[PDB]
Amino acid sequence: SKADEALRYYSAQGYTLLNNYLRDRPYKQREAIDTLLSRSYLNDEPTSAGEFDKAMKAYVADVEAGLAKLPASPELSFVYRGLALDKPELAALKEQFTGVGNIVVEPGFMSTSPDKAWVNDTLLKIRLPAGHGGRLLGDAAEMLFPTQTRLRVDRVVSSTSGDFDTLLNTIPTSRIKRLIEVSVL
User: Fold this and answer.
1) For residues 152 and 106, is the Cβ–Cβ distance under 8 A?
2) Which of 11, 64, 81, 178 is catalytic?
3) Under 8 Å CB-to-CB from 177, ≥6 apart: which residues?
4) CA-CA distance, 150 to 106, in Å (whole number)?
5) Strand order, beta sheet including 110-112
6) What top-level class would CATH report for the domain 1-185?
7) CA-CA distance, 157 to 124, in Å (whole number)?
């Protein structure tokens, strides 16, 4: 079905385009339009801003329903994601991510891994509740999450406090300033 192939295009290359659009970070407005026409979401050049977003959302929807159609893996309990929080432009996110009890909403599709986390300034040990939206990709290791999944900040460990070492080694890796334990709501 079209739903499944939408997930694959996103997975193979469309992600940087789509995620940037969804996080409302800067992106190449042309490429996205070319993509929509390429994938028959729009039949002709968009005459308005309304047309563009409508189409763009319909595209997101197809990836989501595509990601939903997969089988859940309730054996998994923890997943991990490396994060570059210390960059000056992202200090808005950094402030939210460090606050214990703060809710963080990832508007795009959250990329994670059950196996390890790519080394950065921030590592996320992500707790997983029963019946979550996150799916293992495999053929499409990587677990991806549908648009606007909710995160609760449970615990923030800086390199100063002794808690750093004992928690770190429960996170497979491959400069790390902060370890952040977070639950998916």
Assistant:
1) no
2) 81
3) 85, 86, 121, 122, 158, 159
4) 7
5) 110-112, 143-145, 135-136
6) alpha beta
7) 11
Q: Residue 168: enclosing H or E segment and its boundaries?
A: helix 163-168
Taking each helix axis as running N to C, give the angle between helix 29-38 and helix 15-22, from 0 to 180 degrees, rounded to the nearest 10: 120
Phi, psi of 153 (to 5 degrees): -80, 110
Measured distance between the N- and C-terminal CA atoms of the chain, rounded to whole angstroms: 30
Our answer to whether residue 111 is catalytic in this structure is yes
Instruction: Take residue 147 and report the two structure tokens written for it.
Output: 């648009």
Strands (DSSP E) found in 13-148: 78-83, 103-106, 110-112, 122-127, 135-136, 143-145
How far apart are the C-alpha atoms of 90 and 54, rounded to whole Å? 28
Whether residue 45 lies in the annotated active site: no
Between vectors from CA 114 to CA 69 and to CA 125, what angle results, nearest 5°? 115
Of 185, 175, 170, nearest in space to 78 by CA: 170
State whether the Cα torsion 185-135-54-92 is positive or negative. positive
Active-site hit among 73, 142, 152, 183? 142
DSSP 3-state percent helix, strand, coil across the chain (nearest 5) = 35, 25, 40
Per the structure block, which two tokens stand in for 151? 């995160």
Structure tokens at 76: 């998994």
Residue extents of the structural domains in the chain = 1-185
